[PDB]
């Protein structure tokens, strides 16, 4: 009762409009019959719940609303690179939320929530790899592939966590061999090789501290590298 | 012995060098007894382990300097911003460190590496407020303080991790009402004052889903409406 909506009400029920619309432009798109009738169980499930004013079930949806969004545009990107291991990762995503949803395994949802990032950006690797022609970097997103299908089957937080930083340091990096591609400059194809040394070695000795700093260094050398292009 | 120094050696090390160029010259800028020490000790355990072959420290000495890299950009930034509480957590990041590593703790350097990002954050958000003289955004900012002081004191990774997701957040909010106010977009402050509500509710109920959920709006956000100018 009190003043009736309030404006974090608002604000959320604001949001996950915003969120639907994108999902239902990606599942027209799509036409993919699971997303299709996730659309229909979303939208009925916000109706009841802003009909009922329940705002932590409001909250859970714009959250979970937010990652069939991502679902989409990973179903969307892994579409058009066709591979059908990712393929087949992304629709694991979407039966494993399905099935976290449906017993409130609120635990599951957030390791699926950076699984999903991590597909995306794998699929993301992928078509930057392609268009480098670089199979170095092949090696390394065939990898991150078997880690992400390991981490979907028997990951933990931390385990999915971790995999996800080295999956954002090999995107950044990739993102940097391309810019040493556009810009001819050779002193930064020397910066992106000693990066992707030390990206090999994350891969081989997943220390966390050296993790978290070698994710510094690449995103602050990417960032550097785009601003002094 | 095998076949000398390994190419991951000498990437490491490229790395600490490159470290040690931009840590000298802050610890020459800043006159700080202090740092001017650790630059001698860090100066010296190097040495001693690029003398020694001894992979695992290099790679330790790589991160550490790293963190007093961070460490020196946030006393120039705290200095300039002349706040006495940030001053504090600038000075506690650096004692806790040289304790972490006296004792080896590894768990601690963690740890304050997102206390040392968080502190960096907070000072460039006080920076934006100012900038803004918004006094709601300083409200948000002196609450921050306040969850640093405690977490510097007694947070856990978990806590930490949380707290270093809504500094980011707030930072980034702070950074979308700037581009309100140099492109005179009514419809983007509208926007902005939905994120804030959003940003606001995470600070009251810190559920790791909403916040997770709500970093990746307000970043996408940020990315839009800086592309969307």
Known sequence: ??????????????????????????????????????????????????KRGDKRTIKQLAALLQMFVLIAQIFQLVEELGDPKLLEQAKRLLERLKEAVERGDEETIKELLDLAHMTYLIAQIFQLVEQLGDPRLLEL???????????????????????????????????????VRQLGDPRLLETAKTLLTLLKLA??????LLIKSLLTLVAETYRQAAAEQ
């Open 1 to 50: 009762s009190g003043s009736g909506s309030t404006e974090e009400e608002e604000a959320l029920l604001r949001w996950f409009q915003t969120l639907l619309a994108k999902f239902d432009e990606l599942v027209k798109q799509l036409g993919d019959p699971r997303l299709l009738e996730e659309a229909r169980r979303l939208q009925e499930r916000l109706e009841e719940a802003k």
């Open 203 to 208: 891969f081989e000795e997943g220390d966390e």
């Open 141 to 179: 997103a065939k990898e991150l592939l078997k880690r992400l299908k390991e981490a979907q089957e028997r990951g933990d937080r931390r385990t999915i966590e971790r995999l996800l930083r080295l999956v954002q340091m090999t995107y950044l990096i990739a993102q940097i061999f391309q810019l």
